[PDB]
Amino acid sequence: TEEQIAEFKEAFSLFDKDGDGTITTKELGTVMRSLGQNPTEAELQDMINEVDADGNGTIDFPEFLTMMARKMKDTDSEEEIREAFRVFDKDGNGYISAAELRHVMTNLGEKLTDEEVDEMIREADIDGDGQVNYEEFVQMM
Ligand SMILES: [Ca+2]
Ligand SMILES: [Pb+2]
Ligand SMILES: [Pb+2]
Ligand SMILES: [Pb+2]
Ligand SMILES: [Pb+2]
Ligand SMILES: [Pb+2]
Ligand SMILES: [Pb+2]
Ligand SMILES: [Pb+2]
Ligand SMILES: [Pb+2]
């Protein structure tokens, strides 16, 4: 929509120091260093390349818009998976145990045994710690 675009155009403007309608490796360098980040010229060219679809060596507003729109979908998606994880994790210690899973399953209408739930933890527990971490949760969804 019109309103959504004018929001991304402000962020775009922040990068485009010169107001010429593109973001350059050096301009992106200036912003990233405002945020306390290094970065090398090599790393900078890579960030540009990942967004510069026409391949003329800078980023234009349409490329910026297309990128930001996919990031916008990744952000929301990440924050929804994160919220579900926090609900399964009762003590908020960063790990979902068997008792926590069984307790949530029970509320979801599924009365499982500890054997059954220990099997579900084992199914997602890649690292074998005995409980489910965040990436495993994201991967298991
Ligand atoms: Ca993505
Ligand atoms: Pb604003
Ligand atoms: Pb510029
Ligand atoms: Pb072009
Ligand atoms: Pb273009
Ligand atoms: Pb371009
Ligand atoms: Pb926990
Ligand atoms: Pb158990
Ligand atoms: Pb694990």
The DSSP secondary structure of 7-48, one letter per residue, reads HHHHHHHHH-TT-SSEE-HHHHHHHHHHTT----HHHHHHHH
Task: Note whether 59 and 13 are same-domain residues.
Answer: yes
- Asked if residue 140 and residue 92 are part of one domain, the reply reads yes
55's enclosing H/E stretch is none
84 C-alpha to ligand 7 centroid (Å): 13
* 89 annotated to a ligand binding site: yes
- The answer to whether 93 is annotated as binding is yes
Euclidean distance between the first and the last CA atom of the chain, given in angstroms as a whole number:
31
Whether residues 69 and 117 share a domain: the answer is: no
Ligand in closest contact with the CA of 97: 7
- Cβ neighbours, 10 Å, residue 25: 19
Q: Tokens representing 138?
A: 């994201």
How much distance in Å is there from the Cα of 25 to the middle of ligand 9?
Answer: 39
How far is the centre of ligand 9, averaged over its atoms, from the C-alpha of 73 (Å)?
27
Residue 129 is labelled as binding a ligand:
yes
- The string over 101-138, giving b where at least 16 C-beta atoms fall within 10 Å of a residue's C-beta and e elsewhere, is bbebbeeeeeebeeeebbebbeebbeeeeebbbeebbe
Which ligand has the minimum distance to the alpha carbon of residue 59?
Answer: 6
Give the end of a domain, one of 37, 59, 74: 74
Domain boundary among 74, 103, 128: 74
Residue 126 sits at the vertex; the CA angle it makes with 123 and 127, to the nearest 5 degrees, is 135
Residue 49 is which amino acid? N
CA distances from 109 to 25, 51, 102, 103, 119 (A): 54, 45, 10, 10, 18
Q: Experimentally, how was this structure solved? A: X-ray
- Domain endpoint, select from 21, 44, 74: 74
How far is ligand 2, taken at its centre, from the CA of residue 10, in Å? 7
CA 9 to centroid of ligand 2, rounded, Å: 10
Residues 82 and 128 in one domain: yes
Say whether both 80 and 136 belong to one domain. Answer: yes
Strand, coil or helix: what is 59? strand
Answer yes or no: do 70 and 81 share one domain: no
User: Could you list the residue range(s) of the whole structural domain that residue 123 is in?
Assistant: 75-141
Q: How far, in Å, is the centroid of ligand 2 from the Cα of 3?
A: 11
Read off φ and ψ for residue 61, nearest 5 degrees: -65, -40
Q: Return the CATH number at 119.
A: 1.10.238.10
